[PDB]
Design a protein around this nucleic acid. Structure first.
Ligand SMILES: Nc1nc2c(ncn2[C@@H]2O[C@H](COP(=O)(O)OP(=O)(O)OP(=O)(O)O)[C@@H](O)[C@H]2O)c(=O)[nH]1
Ligand SMILES: [K+]
Ligand SMILES: [Mg+2]
Ligand SMILES: [Mg+2]
Ligand SMILES: [Mg+2]
Ligand SMILES: [Zn+2]
Lengths: 299, 99, 131, 230, 244, 136, 289
RNA sequence: CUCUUAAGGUAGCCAAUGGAUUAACGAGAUUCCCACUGUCCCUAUCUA
């Protein structure tokens, strides 16, 4: 596996990419050609312009395409998490648009070099070169929305924590405001926030510790509500996918003081509703906030 | 799983000796070693290490340590003595000998 | 300096030393190993037909026999007679480790010498019988 | 670090102590910086700066006009709304092209002494079932890179452009020799396949072939553009 | 009593140092951080000597010895030999050995009582080992691996062999050496344990890259801490199964 | 001065330019190594990259195992026949040119080295010194 | 267990040899498109030993897509090097797709010459309004296009060699007043599944420019029969390629100075014999249905 | 009016051989290998 995708080069928008590639052609290729020179020299000049611009566009597209992960090829946990975060359909459509643009730019470059083989004057060769560069620019301008989407996705996916779905995992789940982030702070050195309102945590947080010289990872999840999956939202789907995919030891945290805003009956109902999730996994129920109320003096 | 059996056994097995002679072999810990005190990096009264001496004198790559300071000689005045090596085409070391 | 000596005694064209050959001939086990060699495809005669004195492979037993009936082989055999001349001899000549040199000389005279001679005689009769 | 750690760090420790003042002074300096850039940048960078400034001013004026206009205040069927998209030719006269411009002399022989072969430098339509003449009897050369099969045809009615296959060359305005050679130049009348345009006669016949006029120079811009003669 | 350090960002402690029960040898290269790392654990209880062997820094690989003696190769200079003699007390015999295999730390793996040697060392070298080190000598290969000094770490308590050693070879070597043996790695997966670490009856020094399970195995087999026997392999079995 | 080398390296006379063939001194099955490049080599017009004792090269195996051949692997030069000066005061040389196969971190593929190993190479590379039986 | 494990030790595969890309140059493919554009009938020449190996499927698809008016036929050459039933089975199987004619090309002792001539006369009669037709010969290198043209002319008008790539440009030959033949350089369509071993055993490259032919010798052992090899080289008793090479070199006296046998030279000679038809071999035809 | 895919299991029938895939020879044209080396890295020195 890879477990981290921070090493993706910056994706420029359409106009910025156009400026970068065209100005690179202007700077890095010679720019003086005279009408008094040989027609072979003139043809070579404009052929070099077309070929160099095409290569620049293609290498930018290839850097985009190689860096981004294959959503289908990754582990199913990562696939479900990235589908929840980024809408896999849009993800694949944008990357496919990049690939199609790369093929079209290559085709334009080949066609116009072949046409420039037969140029008879500087004016005609200049017109053919400008036509090739303009067609490439139109292709690139047709990618404005996918490039912006991919830049946002790259920035977000560079910050995702590295979760190994095959190592030893303590998963933490329950209702909001029960102390999952506080327990993660107590057992690891993660910087998860602890605030007394619902859904303080909107994404998975990872901590680490060592038990008997063995490395364990602890996964704090955003809270789950007792609602059917049709009206379940993406933030809760993060926790649902984590529970379904990570074979681990699950710790369901209960608050008996109802400081969380959910009753003990509601917590038990949520536990029995998410009961089918932890099959063939270790399960444990932890009652937090015992300094306020104890399980012994309950009804 | 039947695959990981021999590999696990060959590294979890601890070999043991057996007799072979009436010879007693015991571990040796010197008295100074077992009376030594544990070093405390954050302590007001601890031993000044050689790196502390180097840092206070010159620092790494500037401090020139004297190796002759650790010599266990009969006389301490002999520590900074230059040992001759050549005399009239002969090596002193292959003539050096008691009696 | 001259071309003949340069292109004969280049370092990459060096031959085995006389003291090494003497050590090979001194012990019976070494002689047996050199007589019974594994089949090597990179050697002349598949590693067989090896003259130990000259440290040289022959393509055939008839070639080995002709080599044995020659003055070059006799020259090497005569060279392999006396003290092997290690560094201790030059040190003793300079006046260094004289007692070590004397002990080595008397060991060669007493124990190593006659055993090497008997091994050479057995090798000679073995080669004469088999060839 | 994981998730939005920079924002969490800003929430937990704040920013640098002079961040707001530094940002405010830089934004105050921006006007002087813009004027100095306009008067100091030279060459291509200066021209690009002027072009971008013009575009920004146009956009700002449009925004002001739209805001003021907002502050002041085809008979399609139901299933089609909420959805989007003289017998004179348009080019009676075009530039004359001489044979010297049309043809290029191709020399043969070891010493290049024979000059009887000619190469057409313009784009051509050779048709179906074309085979090259044997090289010994090949005087007129139409290279394969310059042969065309399709054109971008604009329909005057309905305002669309479709990529259509070429059927024939009807009249090249320069010469009947160019017409029979199939030369595609500006003002050439070609025949195009209009099957995907969905044209039906008054008698119920499906139209799949009509005339169009080439309105560009394919030798210059590498493609054939035409207007359908409806 | 297992510590982790580096000699100038290198994990090969046994290459650049030699540790016995009565003295320690460290290379002179660079600053005094390596010397002070040994000094933090050793105090002034046993001598610690900066030294070079034939001008090189590889003293753990060039030299071999135990609490009673030290053997240096013939490439040692007279000045270095005199430096060692002046730095060490008279209770440690020092001998320069005329041996063809000059990497004594590679060809000899010894403790205070037993020694395993390269099967092609000289008989005079064997007798010199017996006389100077005061030990019994056995010609062995560690599961066919020559260079026992580089492929074994040995003390009077226990021993660590390279991870490709068969069970029968471990049994035979344990019978010969009269100490418990274990197979494992050091410095995060290295099979050159003898050049990876140095050890005595009361201290082990490995590289910084040695993992926690490897350190636990080393502590258990060398009986370093007060509550570390060789029988806690059963208690570490879960961690070792997960780690392997 | 290469990745995995311990410390700086002082200049040694260059003996092996690109195209040279040296013996293989390890036990990995290779018989000889053919030098195709020298790590850390300089840039100069017409000048061939050349290796010396203790240098890391890229080598192909000409003679050896068929599975071992037809690939490029890092190697470390441990013997050279070109004389070089030791700072202690002598020029010295070996009979042959010889190297060992290693990885980019400087770790040996084999388990032992046959024949003498130069002091410069052994002191530069800790794994060579660990696998060496004879050091000069 | 393949590519990923090699990079960990720093091992990189050697650079691909430039000899194995012969038949893929832009010059050669420009010549091919020239002869196809000039041809009314295209003859694809196949080697009867490996006819599916020597098929240019991409060129055939291009012809059926872009130039459907040109007539493409198959000539299975070198039928003398295969058993009669093998050639008959290959003719039957290839006739399900295209008209296929068995052939043995030779100026003096040929087979199929009259059948090919009457077929070309039929094509001329079908194009009686064209005043002439051209027949372009295409196929893999060293399949025998020049030999077939010389057979039809009954005269050495096209240069012929056992080495691949003898023909380098196109050439017009007048067979009759209305029939022209066009000789063309050999082509190798690019592909990723076709390895250097397959390229070498299709007779594409000259063996003198390959690096280590000993690694390709096991391909010879797999493709040939043991009895045929031992009858050709008068040896026996080998168990693998290295011992086969060693026995052959020692029998032939191909020893280098110092005693090591000339493995590369013997291997190059074996590959030359295999490709040139001194060792009998063929690929099995498809099973009858 | 009709024509072509019948042939079958690593060597056939049919008339020693089934051939120009021709030995030998060549200041003819060309590719490769061993050996060899100042062709080269990289130039230095000696004589008339
Ligand atoms: N046995 C046999 N050999 C043939 C036959 N036809 C050609 N050959 C041989 O095969 C080799 C290839 O001959 P070419 O005529 O040059 O083949 P090509 O396809 O023209 O090859 P290139 O011109 O190099 O692309 C020659 O040595 C011929 O003698 C055949 O029908 N039977
Ligand atoms: K040919
Ligand atoms: Mg929370
Ligand atoms: Mg140059
Ligand atoms: Mg040809
Ligand atoms: Zn002899």
């Amino acid at each position: 596996m890879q477990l981290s995708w921070k090493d993706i080069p910056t994706v420029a928008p359409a106009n910025d990419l156009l400026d970068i590639v065209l100005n690179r052609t202007q700077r890095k290729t010679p720019t003086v050609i005279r009408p008094g020179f040989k027609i072979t020299r003139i043809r070579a000049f404009y052929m070099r312009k077309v070929k160099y611009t095409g290569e620049g566009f293609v290498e930018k597209f290839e850097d985009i395409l190689k860096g981004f992960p294959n959503i289908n090829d990754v582990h199913p946990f990562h696939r479900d998490l990235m589908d929840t975060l980024y809408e896999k359909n849009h993800y694949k459509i944008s990357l496919a648009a990049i690939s199609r643009a790369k093929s079209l730019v290559e085709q334009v470059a080949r066609d116009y070099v072949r046409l420039l083989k037969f140029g008879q004057s500087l004016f005609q060769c200049k017109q053919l070169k400008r036509a090739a560069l303009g067609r490439m620019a139109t292709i690139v301008k047709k990618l404005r929305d996918p490039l912006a989407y991919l830049e946002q996705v790259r920035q977000h996916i560079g910050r995702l924590p590295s979760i190994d779905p095959n190592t030893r995992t303590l998963l933490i789940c329950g209702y909001p405001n029960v102390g999952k982030s506080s327990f993660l702070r107590c057992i690891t050195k993660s910087d998860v926030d602890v605030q007394p309102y619902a859904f303080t945590t909107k994404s998975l947080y990872v901590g680490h510790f060592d038990y008997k010289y063995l490395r364990f990872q602890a996964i704090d999840t955003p809270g789950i509500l007792d609602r059917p999956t049709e009206e379940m939202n993406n933030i809760e789907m993060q926790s649902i996918y984590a529970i379904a995919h990570l074979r681990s030891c699950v710790l369901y945290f209960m608050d008996l003081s109802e400081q969380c805003g959910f009753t003990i009956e509601a917590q038990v109902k949520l536990f029995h509703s998410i009961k089918p999730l932890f099959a063939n996994k270790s399960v444990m129920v932890v009652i937090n906030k015992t300094d306020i109320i104890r399980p012994e003096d309950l009804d | 799983s039947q695959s990981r059996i021999n590999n696990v056994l060959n590294k979890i097995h601890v070999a043991q000796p057996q007799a072979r002679d009436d010879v007693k072999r015991t571990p040796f810990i010197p008295e100074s070693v077992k009376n030594l005190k544990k070093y405390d990096p954050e302590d007001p009264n601890r031993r000044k290490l050689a790196r502390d001496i180097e840092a206070e004198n010159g620092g790494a790559g500037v401090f020139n340590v004297n190796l002759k300071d650790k010599y266990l000689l009969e006389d301490d005045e002999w520590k900074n003595d230059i040992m001759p090596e050549i005399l009239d085409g002969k090596n002193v070391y292959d003539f050096l000998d008691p009696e | 300096m001259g071309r003949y000596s340069v292109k004969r005694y280049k370092t990459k064209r060096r031959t085995r030393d006389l003291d090494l050959i003497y050590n090979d001939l001194s012990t019976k086990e070494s002689v047996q190993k050199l007589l019974n060699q594994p089949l090597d495809e990179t050697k002349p005669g598949l590693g067989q037909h090896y003259c130990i004195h000259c440290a040289k492979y022959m393509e055939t037993a008839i070639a080995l026999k002709t080599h044995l009936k020659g003055k070059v082989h006799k020259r090497r055999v005569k060279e392999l007679r006396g003290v092997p001349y290690t560094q201790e001899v030059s040190d003793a000549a300079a006046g260094y480790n004289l007692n070590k040199f004397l002990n080595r000389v008397q060991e060669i005279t007493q124990s190593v010498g006659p055993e090497k001679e008997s091994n050479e005689a057995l090798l000679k009769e073995h080669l004469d019988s088999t060839l | 670090p994981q998730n939005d750690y920079i924002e969490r760090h800003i929430k937990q420790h704040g920013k640098r102590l002079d961040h707001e003042e530094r940002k405010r002074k830089r934004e105050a300096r921006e006007s002087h910086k813009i004027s100095e850039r306009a008067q100091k940048l030279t060459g291509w960078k200066g021209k690009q700066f002027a072009k971008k400034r013009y575009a920004e001013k146009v956009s700002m004026r449009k925004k002001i006009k739209a805001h003021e206009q907002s502050k002041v205040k085809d008979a399609l069927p139901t299933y089609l709304l909420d959805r989007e998209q003289k017998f004179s030719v348009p080019l009676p006269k075009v530039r004359g092209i001489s044979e010297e411009e049309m043809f290029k002399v191709i020399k043969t022989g070891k010493s290049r002494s024979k000059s009887w072969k000619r190469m057409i430098t313009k784009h051509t339509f050779v048709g179906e079932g074309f085979t090259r003449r044997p090289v010994k009897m090949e005087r007129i050369i139409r290279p394969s890179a310059l042969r065309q099969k399709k054109a971008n045809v604009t329909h005057p009615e309905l305002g669309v452009t479709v990529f259509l296959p070429i059927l024939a060359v009807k009249k090249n305005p320069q010469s009947p020799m160019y017409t029979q050679l199939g030369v595609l130049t500006k003002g050439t009348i070609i025949e195009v396949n209009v099957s995907e345009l969905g044209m039906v006669t008054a008698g119920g016949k499906v139209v799949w072939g009509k005339y169009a006029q080439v309105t560009n120079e394919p030798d210059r811009d590498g493609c054939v553009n035409a207007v359908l003669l409806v | 009593m297992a510590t982790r350090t580096q000699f100038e960002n290198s994990n090969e402690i046994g290459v650049f140092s030699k540790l016995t029960n009565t003295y320690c040898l460290v290379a002179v290269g660079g600053s005094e951080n390596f010397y002070s790392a040994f000094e933090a654990e050793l105090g002034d209880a046993i001598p610690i000597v900066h030294t070079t062997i034939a001008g090189t820094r590889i003293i753990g690989r060039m030299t071999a010895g135990n609490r009673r003696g030290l053997l240096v190769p013939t490439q040692t200079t007279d000045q270095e030999l005199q430096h060692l003699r002046n730095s060490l007390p008279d209770s440690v015999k020092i001998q320069r050995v005329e041996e063809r295999l000059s990497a004594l730390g590679n060809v000899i793996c010894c403790n205070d009582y037993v020694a395993l040697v390269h099967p092609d060392i000289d008989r005079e070298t064997e007798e010199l080992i017996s006389d100077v080190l005061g030990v019994e000598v056995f010609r062995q290969t560690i599961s066919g691996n020559i260079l026992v000094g580089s492929y074994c770490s040995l003390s009077n308590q226990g021993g660590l062999v390279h991870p490709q050693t068969s069970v029968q070879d471990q049994e035979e070597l344990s019978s010969l050496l009269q100490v418990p043996l274990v197979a494992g790695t050091v410095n995060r997966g290295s099979s050159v344990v003898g050049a990876g670490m140095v050890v005595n009856d009361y201290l082990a020094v490995t590289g910084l890259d040695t993992t926690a399970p490897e350190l636990s195995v080393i502590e258990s087999i060398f009986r370093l801490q007060d509550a570390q026997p060789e029988s806690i392999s059963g208690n570490l079995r879960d961690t070792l199964i997960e780690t392997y | 001065s290469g990745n995995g080398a311990q410390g700086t390296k002082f200049r040694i006379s260059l003996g092996l330019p690109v195209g040279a063939i040296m013996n293989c001194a390890d036990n990995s099955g290779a018989r000889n190594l053919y030098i195709i490049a020298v790590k850390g080599s300089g840039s100069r017009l017409n000048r061939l990259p050349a290796a010396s004792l203790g240098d890391m090269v890229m080598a192909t195996v000409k003679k050896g195992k068929p599975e071992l051949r037809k690939k490029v692997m890092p190697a470390i030069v441990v013997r050279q026949a070109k004389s070089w000066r030791r700072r202690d005061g002598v020029f010295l040389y070996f009979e042959d040119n010889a190297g060992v196969i290693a990885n980019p971190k400087g770790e040996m593929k084999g388990s032992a080295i046959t024949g003498p190993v130069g002091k410069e190479c052994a002191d530069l590379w800790p794994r060579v010194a660990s696998n060496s039986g004879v050091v000069v | 267990m393949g590519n990923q494990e090699d990079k960990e030790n720093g091992w990189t595969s050697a650079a691909k040899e430039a000899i194995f890309s012969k038949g893929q140059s832009k010059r050669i493919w420009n010549e091919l498109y020239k002869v196809i554009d000039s041809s009314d009938v295209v003859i694809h020449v196949l080697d009867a030993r490996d006819p599916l190996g020597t098929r240019c499927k991409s060129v055939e698809e291009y012809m059926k897509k872009e130039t459907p008016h040109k007539h493409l036929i198959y000539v299975l050459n070198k039928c003398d090097l295969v058993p009669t039933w093998v050639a008959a089975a290959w003719v039957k199987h290839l006739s399900k797709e295209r008209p296929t004619l068995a052939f043995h090309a030779s100026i003096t002792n040929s087979f199929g010459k009259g059948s090919l001539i009457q077929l070309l006369r039929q094509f001329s009669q079908l194009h009686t309004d064209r005043k002439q037709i051209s027949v372009g010969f295409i196929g893999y290198p060293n399949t025998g296009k020049s030999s077939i043209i010389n057979t039809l002319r009954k005269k050495k008008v096209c240069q012929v060699a056992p080495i691949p790539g003898e023909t380098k440009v196109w050439q017009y030959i007048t067979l009759m007043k209305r029939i022209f033949l066009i000789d063309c350089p050999g082509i190798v369509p690019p592909s990723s599944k076709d390895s250097e071993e397959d390229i070498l055993f299709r007779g594409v490259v000259r063996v003198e420019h390959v690096t280590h032919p000993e690694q390709y010798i096991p391909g010879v052992l797999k493709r040939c029969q043991v009895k045929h090899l031992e009858r050709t080289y008068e040896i026996s008793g080998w168990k693998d390629a290295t011992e086969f090479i060693e026995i052959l070199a020692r029998k032939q006296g191909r020893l280098l100075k110092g005693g090591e046998p000339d493995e590369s030279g013997v291997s190059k000679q074996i590959l030359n014999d295999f490709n040139r038809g001194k060792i009998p071999w063929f690929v099995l035809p498809p099973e009858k249905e």
